[model samples]
Target: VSLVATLIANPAKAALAPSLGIKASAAVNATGLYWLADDIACDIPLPLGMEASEADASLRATLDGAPIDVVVQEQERRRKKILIADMDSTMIGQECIDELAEEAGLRDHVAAITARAMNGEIAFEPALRERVALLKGLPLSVIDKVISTRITLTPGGPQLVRTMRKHGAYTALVSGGFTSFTRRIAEMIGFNEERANRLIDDGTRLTGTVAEPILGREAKVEKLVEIAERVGLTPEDAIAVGDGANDLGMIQLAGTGVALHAKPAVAAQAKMRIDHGDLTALLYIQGYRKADFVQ
Candidate 1:
C-alpha cells in the first residue's frame, strides 16, 4: 500500500458512520480500514498498485451527498512536525485589516481592496500599503477593543494548535496582516512564533506606512524554507494552511498544503481543500482523532 484516504466531518456533527466506512473500503478496494475519531473521521488504506486518483474517485462516489470531507495522501510523513499558517480569514473568522478599516471609517473601500487582493486580482503589497495609508492617524489603543469584541478565533483553533504542540510539533503564525494582530492572536492560539508586516506608530497613532520589505507572497515562501532549514526538517515535514493569494506560495511549497475555506482561484489550485469543516478539519486530514486533541 502506498497511500491512504481519510474521510471527515465537522467535530460538532459526526456523520461518518461505521457503515459508511465499510462501503467506502469496498468501493476503493482498501486493504484495511480504521477509525481516527469514533464517528467524525475514518481512514482506509489502499491496496498495492491502486492509483490514488482512482481510489479518491471511488470513495467520493460511495460517499456522495454526505457532509464528509475527503483527503488522500502518502502514508509516510502524514503527520507533520511543523505548522505554517496564515492568520486573517484562515485562523480567525474575519480579516484583521477589514476590521481595522471599519474602525477607521473606511470599511467599504478597504474591504473592496481586500477582496481584490485576496482573490489575486491585485498585487498584495500595494493593496496593503493603500489600506494602511487610509488608516493613518487612528489611535493604536483602539486595538484593544478590536481584540476583545470584534475578532474571533476560527472554530477548533485551540484544539488544532494545542494538540499539535502537545505531540511535539512546532507551529508558526504567518500572515500578511499587521504584526499588531498577529502578535496577540498568535499568543492566544499558542503558536511558537508570529510574523507579519509591522505598522509604524508614533506612540499614539499610525504613520500611514509599513516598514520596508513587506512580508508578502514570496516572503511567506521564504519563511517556510527558513523554518524548515533551521529546524533540520525538509519542507515535506510541514503542513501549511491559508486562504489568501499571498498564502498560495507557502501552501504550495509545504508537503501538506491545505486551502482552508479559500477564495475561488486559491481553492482551485489546492490539492486539498476544506470548506464545510472548521479548523479541526486540518487535524482530521492528518489522521488525528477527537480524543487525541489537547487543551
Candidate 2:
C-alpha cells in the first residue's frame, strides 16, 4: 500500500522544513499552516510490503532528535470521519484527579500513584480506587474548583475539534476520568458526546467511590467500536488520541492511533507519536493543511 508521512515541529522551534531530508522523496511539497514555519507536511509513496513502523523509523532517524513529530500511514483514509479522545493530559493539560487531590491535601501522594498507573506500572482501577479513597471527606464542590483553577485546555484543542466537525467528522470525548469533568470539557471542546466514570457523592461530599464498571483501557476500545457503529462508520474511518496506558486499547485499534505526549510504553506502540506539537498535530497527520484549520 502507498503511504503518506507528515512531520510537525514544535511551534517555538519552527524546524520542520530544515529537517525534511529523509529517505523518501516528497510526492508533495511541504505545506504550511497559517503561513507559519513551525509545521509542514509532505506526502511520499512507500514501496509495497514496507511497514509504517519501518518508514517511521527511517524518517525519524533523519531528525537526529530534533523536537519534530512524524506519522506514517496508508494514503487511503488519510482523513478520518470519527474522533475519540482521552481527556487528561491529551485534550487537557492536566490530569483531573491529580489536580483534585490537591484540594484534599493529598496531591503528592495521589499524583505518584497516578503517574505509575498511567505509565502502566499498576492496574488503573486499583490505582484510581486507592486514590479516590484518600479523598473520603472532601466536599464534592472541590471538583468544580479544580476545573476552574487547575485544568487547562491543551493548545490547538479547540481548533482540532472545530476543524474536524466543520469537515463533518463526529467527535467524542471518552475518558477514564469523571463525568463531572468530561461533561464540561466536552462542551468546551465541542465534542458531539462524552462518556466517563461517575464520581459518587453523598449529598454534599465525595463518597470516595466511583460507579461500577470503571471506564478503563478496554472500555475505550469498546467506545471506538460503539461510536463507529453509531455513526455508520468503521474503526478504519476513525482517529483516536490519548496519552495513558488505558488509552492503548483504542489507540492500537483505531485507523489512525495517535499517542500524544503519551507514556513511554504507549508511545512505543502507537502508529503516530507526537511529542512536540500540540493537539493540532492530530489534524496535520490526517492530511489537513494549515489553511484547513477551522479556528
Highest TM-score against the true fold, candidate: 1
Please give, for residues 131-236, the per-residue lDDT of candidate 2 as tens digits. Answer: 9888888987898888888889998899889999999999999888899999999999899999999989988999999999787999999999999999998999
Which residue runs does candidate 2 get wrong by more than 4 Å?
18-39, 46-51
Q: For every model shown, what is its TM-score relative to the native structure? A: 0.96, 0.91
Please, what are the lDDT tens digits per residue for candidate 1 over residues 169-191? 89999989988999999999999
Task: Name the regions of candidate 1 deviating beyond 4 angstroms.
Answer: none
TM-score between candidate 2 and the true structure: 0.91
TM-score of 1: 0.96
